[model samples]
Target: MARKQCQVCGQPATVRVEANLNGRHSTMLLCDDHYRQLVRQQKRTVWSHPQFEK
Candidate 1:
């Protein structure tokens, strides 16, 4: 696997792309502090034009 340093804090990230719920995706370009903050927040549900769920 590939890894990179956080863009903001210059800390090493575990991976490049981080996957989240509701089809939301974010880059792992954040440090531990920022990552913790993001994990605490609620993510919005991803809506699609066709509506995958019934």
Candidate 2:
């Protein structure tokens, strides 16, 4: 039961985002829709593909 779900919503996660802050690291699960929203909003540092980078 290691399935991952969206961090904001309880939707099936399509991708995983990782972060490193001052030697501390963490990860988040996000659905396709939420991930797109995050990227569009320019919130946290969401590592994405070159095409998705904006």
Candidate 3:
């Protein structure tokens, strides 16, 4: 099967990352650059608990 393009940047995806939010899961194909960047941002955006400080 052909690989999907990177969900962030316009490059070929080498990794697949799945995200589950509110019990809904979705997949995203990402290049190494974007994959690293995504998790870092998610830590601040999605995974960060507002009630607790990191």
- The local distance difference test score of each candidate is 0.64, 0.81, 0.79
Give the candidates in order of lDDT, highest first.
Answer: 2, 3, 1
Q: What are the per-residue Cα lDDT tens digits for candidate 2 across 1-54?
A: 577788788887888888888878777899888878878888667555688667
> How many clashes in candidate 3?
0
Off by over 4 Å in 2: 43-54
- Point out where model 3 deviates above 4 Å: 1-3, 42-54
Residue-wise C-alpha lDDT for candidate 3, range 24-50, written one tens digit per residue: 887789998888887787676545446
Evaluate model 1: give its lDDT.
Answer: 0.64
Q: What is the lDDT of residue 19 in candidate 2?
A: 80
How far off is residue 17 in model 1, in Å? 5.2
Put the candidates in TM-score order, highest first.
Answer: 2, 3, 1
**TM-score list, all predictions:** 0.37, 0.61, 0.53
| Candidate 3, residue 15: how far the Cα is off, in Å | 1.2
Q: Which of the two, 1 or 3, has more lDDT?
A: 3
lDDT of 2: 0.81
Write the residue-wise lDDT of candidate 1 on 2-49 in tens digits.
666877676676535466868878655776667666765755457356
